[PDB]
Amino acid sequence: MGLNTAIATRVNGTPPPEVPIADIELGSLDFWALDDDVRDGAFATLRREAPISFWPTIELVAGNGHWALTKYDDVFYASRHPDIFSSYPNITINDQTPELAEYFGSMIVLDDPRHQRLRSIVSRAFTPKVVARIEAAVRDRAHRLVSSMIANNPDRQADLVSELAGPLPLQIICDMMGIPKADHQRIFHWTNVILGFGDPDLATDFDEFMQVSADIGAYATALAEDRRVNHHDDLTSSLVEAEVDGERLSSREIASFFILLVVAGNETTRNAITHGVLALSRYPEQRDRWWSDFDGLAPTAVEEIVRWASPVVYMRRTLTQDIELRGTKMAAGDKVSLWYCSANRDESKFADPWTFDLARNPNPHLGFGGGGAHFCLGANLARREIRVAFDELRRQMPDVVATEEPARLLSQFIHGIKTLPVTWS
Ligand code: HEM
Numbered sequence: 001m002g003l004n005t006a007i008a009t010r011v012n013g014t015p016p017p018e019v020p021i022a023d024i025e026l027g028s029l030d031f032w033a034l035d036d037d038v039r040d041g042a043f044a045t046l047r048r049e050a051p052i053s054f055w056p057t058i059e060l061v062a063g064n065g066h067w068a069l070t071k072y073d074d075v076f077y078a079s080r081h082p083d084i085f086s087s088y089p090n091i092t093i094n095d096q097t098p099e100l101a102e103y104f105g106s107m108i109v110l111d112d113p114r115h116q117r118l119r120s121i122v123s124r125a126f127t128p129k130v131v132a133r134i135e136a137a138v139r140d141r142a143h144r145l146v147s148s149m150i151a152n153n154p155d156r157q158a159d160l161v162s163e164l165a166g167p168l169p170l171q172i173i174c175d176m177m178g179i180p181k182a183d184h185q186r187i188f189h190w191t192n193v194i195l196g197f198g199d200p201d202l203a204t205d206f207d208e209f210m211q212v213s214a215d216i217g218a219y220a221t222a223l224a225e226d227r228r229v230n231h232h233d234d235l236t237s238s239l240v241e242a243e244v245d246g247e248r249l250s251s252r253e254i255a256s257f258f259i260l261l262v263v264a265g266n267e268t269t270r271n272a273i274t275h276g277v278l279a280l281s282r283y284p285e286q287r288d289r290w291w292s293d294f295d296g297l298a299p300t301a302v303e304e305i306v307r308w309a310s311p312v313v314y315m316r317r318t319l320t321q322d323i324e325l326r327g328t329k330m331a332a333g334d335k336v337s338l339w340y341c342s343a344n345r346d347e348s349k350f351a352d353p354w355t356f357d358l359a360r361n362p363n364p365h366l367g368f369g370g371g372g373a374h375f376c377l378g379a380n381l382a383r384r385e386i387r388v389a390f391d392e393l394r395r396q397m398p399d400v401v402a403t404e405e406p407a408r409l410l411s412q413f414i415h416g417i418k419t420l421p422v423t424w425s
Pocket of ligand 1: 079107108109119260261264265266268269272306310311312315367368369370371372373374375376377378379381382
């Protein structure tokens with residue numbers, strides 16, 4: 001009904017309501033359904049009263065529980081000490097088998113030296129011609145998707161997720177890899193079934209999920225085998241040709257890197273853009289400031305959108321040895337969860353953490369993690385994707401605004417918005 005009228009604004013800088021520590025149940029799915037004000041107040045209570053605490057996994061096999069690190073300094077320290085806080089082979093709270101974790105996770109589930117081998121050769125594949133292709137695709141696909149929003153919608157209403165934030169990062173990944181247009185339908189279907197496993201409200205058939213995950217891997221392996229014969233100016237070809245000290249990637253390694261990208265390089269940028277449109281809709285003075293000086297404010301605006309959205313809520317590690325932090329003794333083998341959503345509101349680190357300030361500087365947020373060995377390999381591409389999406393909104397539909405509160409994804413790991421209706425003139 002009200003899909004033609006702007007959502008309520010909020011007063012910028014307002015802290016979340018006080019949340020009693022007894023109300024906080026990180027191991028309960030019902031807790032993850034509470035809205036972001038209750039969640040943000042919950043992590044505020046933990047930072048203040050119980051900054052390291054142990055929680056059960058969400059069940060629905062219950063596994064071992066995890067120590068939640070909620071303070072910026074603890075998440076930073078854990079990120080920079082991977083010999084103690086290991087990523088091998090699990091980076092979510094629920095454990096996967098090592099072979100499945102490596103198949104879907106590529107370098108993100110490895111420690112050095114295997115991680116550094118893989119990351120160094122992948123990094124070398126981002127050659128000048130490949131980077132030029134990627135940068136042209138970001139602008140082409142953002143411009144087309146926003147133009148299509150206008151062409152497809154005489155009522156000037158659309159769902160930002162389905163029409164812009166959802167397709168943009170996966171179309172860019174298709175273009176970067178050199179995937180033909182005619183294969184988008186298969187890549188989107190496979191990717192949507194894989195992502196859907198992360199949504200407990202969307203039925204995921206197990207057999208269908210295993211078969212799409214085999215097919216997408218076979219598809220990327222065949223794409224790499226073709227580029228071994230036929231060099232194109234795309235990332236698949238530079239991945240097959242890249243070499244560090246004689247070491248080269250197998251086609252199987254390339255395929256798993258692609259499977260990592262269609263999740264980790266895709267739903268994260270989607271949610272940064274959708275939370276950024278939500279935030280501009282709640283704080284229109286920030287939208288006005290940015291539009292008044294788009295290029296001058298873009299570098300700090302994009303970082304503040306990532307700090308504010310924290311699209312990756314947490315990453316997990318596993319202790320290789322006993323450690324005591326803040327007086328809390330944790331044992332070798334224990335799970336540790338690193339709450340970037342909470343680090344990104346830590347009052348010791350950020351002046352006025354509840355203010356959404358697109359001029360914020362400095363902004364040492366941990367939305368791409370705490371830094372160190374696994375620091376987001378796509379961070380510069382994500383920053384460009386965010387900037388150019390907002391640039392195309394500003395150029396083509398500058399008053400675009402959310403018209404209904406978002407439908408939120410029920411997830412502990414992904415700060416997901418499933419739908420965000422918008423309207424424009
Ligand atoms: C706003 C969007 C994004 C966010 C918030 C995000 C966040 C993250 C985080 C938190 C990590 C783990 C960092 C750590 O453990 O210390 C990560 C890793 C990674 N991300 Fe991103 N990411 C985004 C976009 C992208 C994009 C666009 C790409 C590429 C298309 C990408 C590729 C990767 C890769 C390959 C890794 C694994 C790096 C490693 O293990 O060494 N990310 N990202």
